Amino acid sequence: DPFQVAVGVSNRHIHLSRTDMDTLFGPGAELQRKKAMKQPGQFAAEETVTLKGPKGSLSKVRVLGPLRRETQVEVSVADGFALGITPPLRQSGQLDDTPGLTIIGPQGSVTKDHGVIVAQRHIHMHPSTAAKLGLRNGDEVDVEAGGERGGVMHRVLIRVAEASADEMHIDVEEANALCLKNDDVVRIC
Amino acid sequence: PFQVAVGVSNRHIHLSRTDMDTLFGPGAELQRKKAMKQPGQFAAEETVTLKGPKGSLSKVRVLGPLRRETQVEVSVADGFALGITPPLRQSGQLDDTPGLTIIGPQGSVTKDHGVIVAQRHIHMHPSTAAKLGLRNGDEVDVEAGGERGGVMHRVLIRVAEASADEMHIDVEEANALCLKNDDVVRIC
Ligand SMILES: CC(C)(COP(=O)(O)OP(=O)(O)OC[C@H]1O[C@@H](n2cnc3c(N)ncnc32)[C@H](O)[C@@H]1OP(=O)(O)O)[C@@H](O)C(=O)NCCC(=O)NCCS
Ligand SMILES: CC(C)(COP(=O)(O)OP(=O)(O)OC[C@H]1O[C@@H](n2cnc3c(N)ncnc32)[C@H](O)[C@@H]1OP(=O)(O)O)[C@@H](O)C(=O)NCCC(=O)NCCS
Ligand SMILES: [Zn+2]
Ligand SMILES: [Zn+2]
Ligand SMILES: [Zn+2]
Ligand SMILES: [Zn+2]
């Protein structure tokens, strides 16, 4: 079924700028690959950080490479409460009016004034696949999950880009609410 | 009409008298902290620590009153934190379930069973069930609006006299829908 798409489940994690990488891991430090993600060029790094909010901290928070233009922190709704912040629900890069927190690495720390979000679900899709399915960048679709916690997710954003692999991204709470894990399959309706 | 209020459940425990005595002392009684929506049910002041093969969860709320048999309700995520795989179950369906060590102020007990991931359900008063043409054991689709809107399939209807109209979901199910206590969802 060509409308079936693989699931990628995201635990809390961070993307770093070079300025913050330098602060956290030392000047000129380079991320080490641990595991490639499904999206071209993206990977889980060996490196981890601590996130510290007004209420508490989350440790062993995975860094995702490569480095980006701007630091971005993705956490679950649950994580927000543990941290003591209220991150808005956003697509990647949509960081206007977002809270920050303190990031701690082995060689230093920095207190960000912004950049923390709850990740809004979405489907990455290659232009060829989009053509075959009749979808365009920015379309919203329903997505159905089978099984014991089966259901439908409404108005899921389609992100079409040449450097993309066909994959739906949801966070760990969204996945557990559907009894899904990495490489499970869902269906675009 | 077909609208029902949401009740969101964090991890918690229901205790037997035998286990209550061990954990909190012989003849100890639960102290009421807050009434739940369901008649007779309440969050207690008492809390325990849950300990599994991999790790522990602390400040786990006890729900009263005491029951015939200890039952532990945790999230899928909680299962991974503890190091067990609880099946998805309705309350009281505890055959072939894993256990845990329950740690209290006056003692501890290692249970050989009783931990579940709570399966979502709607508590419904018989009058309400009548109005909606629903009977006990029926399954229904439930829709949530908002920015994580969607539909939950095959939600079990639990009719009983001592019930209030309320959907019960766990904290991950709620956060996956950006719902909290007293938000309204709709039976399809
Ligand atoms: C079951 C219940 C009593 C659990 O007790 P509890 O854990 O003490 O409940 P609380 O609401 O006080 O939870 C407080 C914690 O949840 C956190 N929290 C708040 N919103 C949260 C969210 N959306 N996601 C994750 N955590 C959240 C708080 O930060 C707090 O953390 P802290 O203790 O470290 O300060 C409670 O969930 C409840 O009353 N549910 C109503 C639904 C119901 O009736 N269930 C019946 C089960 S049979
Ligand atoms: C984002 C990512 C790299 C985060 O790295 P990570 O946190 O190190 O990932 P892991 O899968 O190894 O998480 C392992 C932890 O999750 C726990 N875990 C496993 N399944 C779980 C579940 N269903 N619910 C909660 N926790 C779970 C494990 O017990 C373990 O905890 P521990 O470290 O205390 O032992 C990872 O989630 C991922 O690879 N996602 C793929 C999807 C993707 O590409 N997202 C990109 C977003 S831009
Ligand atoms: Zn990310
Ligand atoms: Zn993504
Ligand atoms: Zn319960
Ligand atoms: Zn219930």
Side-chain angles (χ1 to χ4, degrees):
Chain A
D1 184 356
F3 289 89
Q4 281 184 333
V5 68
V7 170
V9 184
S10 296
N11 201 13
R12 69 191 67 88
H13 63 277
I14 191 161
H15 307 261
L16 287 172
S17 68
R18 162 55 58 192
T19 298
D20 293 345
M21 179 71 182
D22 280 356
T23 299
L24 294 167
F25 290 92
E30 294 294 351
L31 291 176
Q32 316 164 66
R33 284 179 169 257
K34 182 176 187 269
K35 178 187 179 187
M37 302 293 91
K38 304 283 197 64
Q39 297 307 304
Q42 303 289 298
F43 61 94
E46 292 290 353
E47 285 73 24
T48 65
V49 297
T50 294
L51 303 182
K52 177 177 179 87
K55 181 175 170 183
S57 299
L58 300 171
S59 68
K60 306 296 174 59
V61 172
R62 186 68 49 192
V63 177
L64 258 66
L67 298 171
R68 298 197 173 179
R69 278 171 48 185
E70 175 187 14
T71 290
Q72 174 174 288
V73 189
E74 298 166 56
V75 306
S76 69
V77 170
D79 292 338
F81 279 96
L83 287 164
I85 55 171
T86 304
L89 186 66
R90 300 289 179 84
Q91 296 297 317
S92 180
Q94 296 175 338
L95 307 179
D96 292 345
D97 303 296
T98 53
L101 39 67
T102 301
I103 312 160
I104 305 122
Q107 296 308 322
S109 59
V110 63
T111 295
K112 308 296 302 188
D113 74 338
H114 81 274
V116 186
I117 60 165
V118 172
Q120 191 178 39
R121 65 203 176 202
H122 53 277
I123 299 170
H124 298 282
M125 187 172 289
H126 192 263
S128 75
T129 300
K132 295 174 182 187
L133 302 185
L135 299 165
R136 320 183 308 188
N137 186 61
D139 278 352
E140 295 179 341
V141 299
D142 288 346
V143 174
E144 185 172 71
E148 283 207 300
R149 272 186 171 179
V152 177
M153 289 168 291
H154 287 155
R155 48 173 313 195
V156 174
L157 187 65
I158 305 297
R159 308 183 66 90
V160 178
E162 251 292 340
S164 298
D166 302 326
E167 185 189 22
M168 183 176 182
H169 280 172
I170 54 178
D171 74 25
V172 63
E173 294 194 285
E174 292 182 304
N176 290 338
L178 295 166
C179 287
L180 297 168
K181 61 202 181 69
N182 264 351
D183 296 309
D184 281 345
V185 179
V186 297
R187 188 175 55 88
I188 303 178
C189 314
Chain B
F2 283 71
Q3 294 181 328
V4 69
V6 169
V8 178
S9 303
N10 198 18
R11 70 186 70 85
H12 63 277
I13 189 162
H14 303 266
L15 296 175
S16 67
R17 166 54 62 195
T18 297
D19 291 343
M20 180 68 188
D21 282 346
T22 301
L23 296 169
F24 290 96
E29 297 289 358
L30 292 171
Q31 305 172 88
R32 284 183 168 258
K33 182 187 161 175
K34 182 192 174 191
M36 303 298 90
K37 298 296 176 47
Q38 299 303 308
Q41 298 289 299
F42 67 88
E45 293 288 358
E46 287 69 32
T47 59
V48 299
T49 294
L50 302 180
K51 180 180 176 61
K54 178 176 169 221
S56 303
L57 298 163
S58 52
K59 224 197 207 181
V60 172
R61 188 66 53 188
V62 181
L63 242 59
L66 297 172
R67 295 191 169 176
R68 278 169 51 187
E69 180 186 11
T70 295
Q71 174 175 289
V72 190
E73 293 165 65
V74 304
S75 69
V76 172
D78 289 342
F80 280 95
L82 292 162
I84 54 169
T85 314
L88 188 61
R89 298 291 178 80
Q90 291 298 322
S91 190
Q93 301 296 100
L94 311 176
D95 293 340
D96 307 296
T97 52
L100 283 176
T101 297
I102 310 167
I103 306 169
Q106 309 306 334
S108 306
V109 57
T110 297
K111 308 296 297 195
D112 74 342
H113 79 280
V115 192
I116 56 172
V117 176
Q119 189 173 39
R120 68 202 170 205
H121 55 279
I122 293 170
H123 297 281
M124 193 168 283
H125 188 273
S127 64
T128 295
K131 292 170 170 59
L132 301 168
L134 286 165
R135 65 182 223 104
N136 190 76
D138 279 347
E139 291 177 331
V140 301
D141 290 352
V142 176
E143 188 178 60
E147 297 299 80
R148 279 188 165 176
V151 172
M152 293 172 282
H153 288 166
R154 303 185 70 104
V155 179
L156 182 72
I157 304 301
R158 303 180 73 81
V159 177
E161 196 58 61
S163 299
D165 301 318
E166 181 189 26
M167 186 173 189
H168 278 174
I169 52 179
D170 76 23
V171 62
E172 301 197 279
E173 289 179 307
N175 286 346
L177 297 163
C178 291
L179 302 169
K180 61 197 266 287
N181 238 60
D182 284 320
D183 289 341
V184 179
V185 295
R186 184 256 289 176
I187 310 179
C188 301

